Structures are given as C-alpha cells and as structure tokens.
Amino acid sequence: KVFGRCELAAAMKRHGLDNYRGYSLGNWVCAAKFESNFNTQATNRNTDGSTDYGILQINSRWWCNDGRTPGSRNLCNIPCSALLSSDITASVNCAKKIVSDGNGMNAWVAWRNRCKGTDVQAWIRGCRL
C-alpha cells in the first residue's frame, strides 16, 4: 500500500504516534514519506546484509528478524515481513520500540535528513486527523 500522507497521518495517529515520545505526528509521517514514500512494501536491501522494511524502513539488523541479517537482535520481536504489512501497526509498534530503545527519531536516517529541521506539520497539514 502506498499511503497518502493524510491517511497515513490518521493511521499513525490512531496508533498513538502523535507525540509519541515527543514526536509529533508530522514527524512520523515525514519519516514515512522519506523513508518509504509511504509505501508499506518498501524494502531496501542493504549491502550490509540488512534490509530496511516497510513504511518506516526499519532495519533488520536490530529491529526485526528477517532471518538473513547478521547480528539480528530482533528487538521488535517480529519478523521483518510483518513490517511490510499494509496495516502499519507492526511498523508503528516497532517504531515505538525503536524509540523506546533509547532512540530518537534520528534512528530514521530519512527523518534525520529530510524531516528534522523541517516543517513536518506540512505532512499533516490539511488532513483529517
């Protein structure tokens, strides 16, 4: 699924991401935008044996198990394929876990690079949250 920004925003909001650990919803939507282009199926197969999965491009080294990534910690305790669901819950839950595991949203390089410092509320602006 490729979300629209507002739809994603609403979904993320339903999942409690707005202001999760102080990150407003737009941050999360922005992260998704730049991580995956809102594409729940996004994968980025890295050369480092990990892959980034899903709308938030959560990486398989620490966060989810894809069974092929060295150093797997599977801290989200999920198969990475769960992060490729059309529903975002697993990604959200894992995203929450990423932050709960002492990361900020700097855990997401696209957030850091493309959302950080920006009008992330643009990503929820004009939406029905």
UniProtKB/Swiss-Prot annotation:
Tissue: In the egg white and polymorphonuclear leukocytes.
Reaction catalyzed: Hydrolysis of (1->4)-beta-linkages between N-acetylmuramic acid and N-acetyl-D-glucosamine residues in a peptidoglycan and between N-acetyl-D-glucosamine residues in chitodextrins
Any one Gene Ontology cellular component term annotated for this protein: extracellular space
Keyword entries, A-Z: Allergen, Antimicrobial, Bacteriolytic enzyme, Disulfide bond, Glycosidase, Hydrolase, Secreted, Signal
Binding residue positions for substrate: D101
Superkingdom of this protein's organism: Eukaryota
Enzyme class, spelled out: hydrolase
GO molecular-function terms, A-Z: beta-N-acetylglucosaminidase activity; identical protein binding; lysozyme activity
A Pfam family annotated for this UniProt entry: Lys
Domain C-type lysozyme per the UniProt entry, residue ranges: 1-129
Disulfide bond sites: C6-C127, C30-C115, C64-C80, C76-C94
Active-site residues (renumbered): E35, D52
E.C. numbers: 3.2.1.17
Subcellular location: Secreted
PANTHER family registered for this protein in UniProt: LYSOZYME C (PTHR11407:SF28)
Function comment: Lysozymes have primarily a bacteriolytic function; those in tissues and body fluids are associated with the monocyte-macrophage system and enhance the activity of immunoagents. Has bacteriolytic activity against M.luteus.
Additional facts recorded: Lysozyme C is capable of both hydrolysis and transglycosylation; it also shows a slight esterase activity. It acts rapidly on both peptide-substituted and unsubstituted peptidoglycan, and slowly on chitin oligosaccharides.
Sequence similarity: Belongs to the glycosyl hydrolase 22 family.
Description of how the protein assembles with itself and partners: Monomer.
Protein name: Lysozyme C
Organism per entry: Gallus gallus (Chicken)
